Amino acid sequence: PAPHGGILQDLIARDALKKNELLSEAQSSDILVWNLTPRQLCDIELILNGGFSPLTGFLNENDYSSVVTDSRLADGTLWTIPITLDVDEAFANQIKPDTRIALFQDDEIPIAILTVQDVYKPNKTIEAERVFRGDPEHPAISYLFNVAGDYYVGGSLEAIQLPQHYDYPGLRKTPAQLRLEFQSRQWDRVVAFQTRNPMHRAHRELTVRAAREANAKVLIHPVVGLTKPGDIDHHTRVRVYQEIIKRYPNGIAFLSLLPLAMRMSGDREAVWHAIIRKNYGASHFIVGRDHAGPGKNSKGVDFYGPYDAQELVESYKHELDIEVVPFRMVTYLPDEDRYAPIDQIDTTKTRTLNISGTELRRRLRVGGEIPEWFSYPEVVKILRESNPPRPKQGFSIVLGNSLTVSREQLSIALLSTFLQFGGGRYYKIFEHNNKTELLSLIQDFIGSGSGLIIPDQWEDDKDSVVGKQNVYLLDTSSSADIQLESADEPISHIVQKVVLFLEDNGFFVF
Template sequence: MANKPHGGVLKDLIARDAPRQEQLAAEAERLPAIILTERQLCDLELIMNGGFSPLEGFMNEKDYDRVVEESRLADGNVFSMPITLDVSQQVLDETKLKAGSRVTLRDFRDDRNLAILTVDDVYRPNKAKEAELVFGGDEEHPAIKYLNTQVHEFYIGGKLEAVNKLNHYDYVALRYTPAEMRAHFDKLGWSRVVAFQTRNPMHRAHRELTVRAARARQANVLIHPVVGLTKPGDIDHFTRVRAYQALLPRYPNGMAILGLLPLAMRMGGPREAVWHAIIRKNHGATHFIVGRDHAGPGKNSKGVDFYGPYDAQHAVEKFRDELGIEVVEFQQVTYLPDTDEYMPRDQVPAGTKTLDISGTELRKRLRTGAHIPEWFSYPEVVKILRESNPPRHTQGFTIFLTGYQNSGKDAVARALQVTLNQQGGRSVSLLLGDTVRHELSSELGFSREDRHTNIQRISFVAAELTRAGAAVIAAPIAPYEESRQAAREAISQAGTFFLIHVATPLEYCERTDKRGIYAKARRGEIKGFTGVDDPYEAPAKADLVVDVSKQSVRSIVHEIILMLESDGFLDRA
C-alpha cells in the first residue's frame, strides 16, 4: 500500500532466520526470566508484531520521559502512551538486572519464553507526573488507580528480540499482524481503508455510520475491535466477535472485513485516541474514526466526565500530518421510523420523529428478555447477545452475610438455602464461615492478613459458582471493610453481589452464646476474637441491614427474598 507505517518502517520483530531463532531459544532458557502479566503480554505482542511501530522494545527513561511530557519519543516520533515494563524490587534483586543485561520475558499462562530484552536502563518513574500528564490526574481514573495500586516501582527499558509468538486458541484466522493486514489489503486491492475501533457490540447505527464514512471517502471498512483488556464490565470478546461476524454480511458488496486487536486499553481519552490512530496506521488504514469521548472511562463519582466530548478528536487532529492518517469524526446517527432509515442527528429536520435505545436500556432489555426491535439491531446479533446475557431469573448471584459470631447469620443462611431450594430454578450453594475454614483455609490463622486471604478464597469460589448460574450464600464474619469490598469487586465480575449486614448487637450475640466461645475469648483462651480483642468494621454500604435481636429468622429471609424478587432473580414469568 502507498501509506507507510508510523515512523517509516514497520518494526516486525518476529525473527525468521532459523539458525538465529534456535540460538535465541537456547539463550532464553539460560537467562533469568521475568513473568509477564496479561497487560504486559498484550503490549509485548504489539511491540513484536509492529503494531506499536516504531517501538522496538519497552521504553527506556529518555523515551518514557518525553512521551509523558510531549507525546513524542526521544527521536521526535509521535507516540502518546507510555509502554513500559514494570518490575518490583524483589524481581530486580533476583535477576540482578542492570544496563547491558539480557533477560527472558515469559508468558505466565504456559511458561513459554517469548522474547529476550537487552536492558537499556532500570529507572524509577514519576508516577504522579505520569498520572497527571497522560491521564489527567483524577485519582478515580481507572488507569491512575491501576498505576497507583498495580504497577511496580521500577521500569525496565530496552529492545526486544522475539523468541516465540504468543499462543492464541480463539479466532486465529482473524488475528492479523500489521504486515498480514497490509498484505490482505493489497490482495483485495484496497488502497483506502477506514478503521473502526470498538470494545462494544455493533448494531445497525454502527453499521450505518461506518458505511457512510466509507462511501464519503470511496474507501473500505476495517472493523478492528479490541480483544485484549478493555473496561471492566464490558461484554466479553467471545460474544462480541460472534456478533461482529454475524453483522459482517450486512455490509454491501464485501465492503468490510474484521480483524482483531490484542490491545490492553488504558481508557486514556485523548492520549489513547492518538495511540489508536498510530496502531491503525501501522495496520495499513488510511482513515480512522474517532468517536465522541473516544476511549474515555465515563464519569467520576461526582458525575463529572474525565475528558471533554471532543478532546480526543482535537488530539488526533493535532498530529494528523505527522501520523499520516485522516481523522473521521464519529457521527451520531438516529433512527427515523417514518422513513425506516438512519440519519446523522445534525441533519434531521426539526419536528421529525426519531427513535433511540441507550446502552442502559439495551442492557435492561437483555436482562429482562424484553423485545429489541429490528430497527435497532439485526436479529442474528440480538440472538447472540441473548445467548450470552440470559434473563435475570437464570443468572447467578451471591448473598454475602457478614456479622459477629452468633449474630444469627448462619441461621439466616441455612434458612435462605432451604427457601431457595424449595422455589427451584437454580442450584444453591452454602459457604458457611466454619465450613470454609475447615475445608479451604485450615492452615490460616486469625491475623488481619489471614482473615483477608480467607475472604478472598470464599470470593473466588463464590464468583465461579455465580458465573455458572448458581445462587451462592456466603456467611463469614468478614470483619474488615477492605476484604468485603474486594469480595464485592471480584464476585461482581461474575454476577450480582448482595451484601447483607446482620447487625445484631455484640451484647446480644454474647448473651445468647450457648457454646461459650465469647466467654473463652474474654478469659484470654482465644486470641484475636472479633468483638473482644479484634475489631469489627461495620459495612458502610450494605444492600440490606437486619438484626436477629429484633427480627425473626423467617422475617429476615422474607426480606432477602423480596429483594431478590424486586431485582428479577426469582421472576420466571
C-alpha cells in the same frame, strides 16, 4: 501508507534466524526471568509484530519522558501513549544496563529477550496527570497506581514468538498478514473501525457511511486485548462482530482481531490508534464521539469532552499520514427510520432516538425488549445469552456477624425456600471457612448462575479475594443490603425478608 517512522518493525521476521539461539538463551539456567503481565503481553505482541512501529522494545526514560510531556519519542516521532515494562523493586534491583533478561508467558513460554538500557522509577503522578488527565477513577490511572510496578525497565527487544493464543487462530492478523490480505484483494483504500463494544445499527451505518465517503473497503478492527473494566467480554463480542459483518454488502468488509491493551485514554489514545491502524495497513481511520473515552466519573463529569479526540487528531492531521474520517453523534431518526450524524439534523423539526449503554445494560438486566431499530436481533440474542437477565443470574446471601439465630438452621430454611421456586437455578450452602481457595470460587458459582447461602462472613483481610457482584449482606447493620430488624429476628421472618428482596431485585419472578 508507510508504517509509522517508515519501517514496519516486524521483529518476528527480523529475528527468524536467531530463534533457536534466542530460544536457548531464554531457557538457560543462569538468565534472569520476568513473567509478563496480561497487559505487558498485549503490548509485547504489538511491539514484536510491528504494530507499535517505530518501537523495537519497551521505552527507556528518555523516550518515556518525551512521550509524557511532549507526545513524542525523543527523536521527535509522534507517539502519545507510553509503552513500558513495569516491574517491582525486588526485580528491578537485580538488573543493570547490558543485562539480558528473558521474558516469558505463563512461566512456560519464552517470548523475547530484552536487553536493558536503563531502570528507573517514574513519578506516577506526573504520568497520571500529563498522559491521562489525573482523575483517580480513570482506568489508566487506577491501573497505574494499583497494578503496574513502580519501576520501568527500558530496553531493546529480540523476538522469539508472539504471545500464545488458542482462540481465533486465524483471526488475529499481524500488520504484515493484514497487508497481504488487503493486497490479495487489491484493496488500496481501507477505512478502519476501532471498537471495544458490541456494534449496533448505528455502528453499521457509520462504518458503511465512512466506506462510501472515503471510497474505501471496510476493516472492522476490534480490540481483544485488555479494554475497560466491566466491558462485555471479547469472546461474546467476536460473536457479535462475526454476526454483524454479514449485514454488510458482500465483499465490502474484513474482520481482524487486535490484541491491543487500551488505556481508555481518549484523545491521546485516538492519536495512538491511528498510528496503530496505519501500521496495520489502513489508509483511513474512523474517530467518532468520545473515541476511546471512559465516560464520566462517579461525580458525573466527563473524563474527556465528546470531541476532544477528534480535535487532537485533527491537529496532528498532517503528520499522521493516515486519513481520519470523523463523525459527530450518529443517532436514530424515528420519523424517517434511518440513522444519521447529529450535525446533519435536528434544529428541532426532526425527532431523534438513542439508547445509551446504561439503558442497554439495564434492558439486559431486566429482560426488557430492545428495539428492532436499535440493533440486529441476532446480535441482541448473543448479548442476552452472555449477559442474562436477573432471573438467570447468580447471587450470594451472606449471613452477617450480628446474627444471633442458628446459622445452620437459617441456611437450611433459605435453601429449602429457594428450592421450592424452581426455574433451573442451582443452590448451595457454601462454607469458605475463610480459606482463599474457597473464597475465590464464590464469583465462579455466581457466574454460573447459582445461588449461594453463606453461613458467616470472611475476615476483612480476605475481602479482596471476593468480587462483590450480586453478593448481598444480611445483617442488623446499616450497611447491610438486607437489613435485619433484630439480631434474633425469627427465621421465618428473615426468610421472607430475603425472598422479597431477591424478588424486588429480579432474581425471582413468579
